[PDB]
Amino acid sequence: AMAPHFKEELRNLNVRYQSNATLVCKVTGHPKPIVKWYRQGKEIIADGLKYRIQEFKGGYHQLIIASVTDDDATVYQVRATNQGGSVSGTASLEVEVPAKIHLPKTLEGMGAVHALRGEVVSIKIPFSGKPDPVITWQKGQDLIDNNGHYQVIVTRSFTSLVFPNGVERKDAGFYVVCAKNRFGIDQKTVELDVADVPDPPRGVKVSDVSRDSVNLTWTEPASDGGSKITNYIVEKCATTAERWLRVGQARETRYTVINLFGKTSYQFRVIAENKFGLSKPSEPSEPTITKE
């Protein structure tokens, strides 16, 4: 009786990159129309791998495209025909994902990255987005350009701010990495702090001596190298044999050493430490002898 007619047309569609696209329609007519799929006008012959063509009771016809990449984001045509007629349709596949930056967990908390002055550093940060986002790095309110100072790397999937010549004090600051595409924009601010290991603590003085204990005291270094000092490490050495050992740690510029041998010649040095690392050891205290 009737000719081929699309009871439900071809729906255009946007998919996430490498996702599976699905095109379906409901065809009607008598006798049952013969349906065929086309990509850019060329008939598709399903391999069941990249393409899969199915139909379901009720005149439903569907095309599934596996792992949709750019090569698949084009036009598709569907055609139905029977002795009395022949109708056709088209659909456009598009991959459209807004730009999004994915900072590493270590960088999500409001915490800066502490770089040891002189140390080369690479702040690598990946992004998503299709089309692949334009990347842009600026320090404060200054677009940063690729040069002898900075090294910028921008691939279609991740970008990295590098300091080829070892970071400098001036480098400390707020870097803003930005990604954009027609479907979205994503900003992120990575803070970078640059400093030195503290200077050696000084003036290690021995006192309150005893048979197995001793009391130490010293003073803060010239500077902490940038970052505040967080703790001092104490080390002891038996003059009898050159070999220093960790004995403890204290926040104060003073500490009580114990488990000493007694009637023994000892020396004590102190190390200053901040978030950036440990300073060189202080001048060792004057040798002293334990009691009893």
DSSP assignments along 122-142, one per residue: EEEEEEEEESPPEEEEEESSS
What topology does CATH give the domain 198-291? Immunoglobulin-like (2.60.40)
The one-letter amino acid at 30: H
The one-letter amino acid at 61: H
Residues recorded for the chain: 292
Closest CA to 190 of 221, 233, 161: 161
Assigned token pair, 48: 């069941």
Do the beta carbons of residue 245 and residue 230 sit within 8 Å?
Answer: no
- Say how many C-beta atoms besides its own lie within 10 A of residue 192's C-beta: 19
Do the beta carbons of residue 186 and residue 99 sit within 8 Å?
Answer: yes
CA 5, 11, 12: angle at the middle one, nearest 5?
135
DSSP class of residue 171?
A: T
**Cα 205 from Cα 207, distance rounded (Å):** 7
- Through-space distance between the first and last CA atoms of the chain, rounded to whole angstroms: 119
3-state class (DSSP) for residue 8 = strand
**Cα 152 from Cα 135, distance rounded (Å):** 10
What topology does CATH give the domain 97-196? Immunoglobulin-like (2.60.40)
Ranges of CATH 2.60.40.10 domains, the chain: 1-95, 97-196, 198-291
Interacting residues of 21 by C-beta distance below 8 A, sequence separation 6+: 13, 15, 64, 65, 68, 72, 93
Question: H or E element: which one contains 35?
Answer: strand 34-39
Resolution rounded to one decimal, in angstroms: 2.9
Interacting residues of 252 by C-beta distance below 8 A, sequence separation 6+: 232
Instruction: Spell out a b/e string for 259-289, using b for 16 or more CB atoms within 10 Å of the CB, else e.
Output: ebeeeeebbbbbbbbbebeebebbebbeeee
Helices of type H across the chain: 105-108
**Cα 292 from Cα 287, distance rounded (Å):** 17
The one-letter amino acid at 51: Y
Q: Count Cα atoms within 13 angstroms, Cβ side, for 274.
A: 23
3-state class (DSSP) for residue 24 = strand
What topology does CATH give the domain 1-95? Immunoglobulin-like (2.60.40)
Gyration radius of the chain's alpha carbons: 35
3-state class (DSSP) for residue 106 = helix
**Cα 21 from Cα 51, distance rounded (Å):** 10
Strand partners, 254: 217
The pairing of beta strand 184-195 with beta strand 113-116: parallel
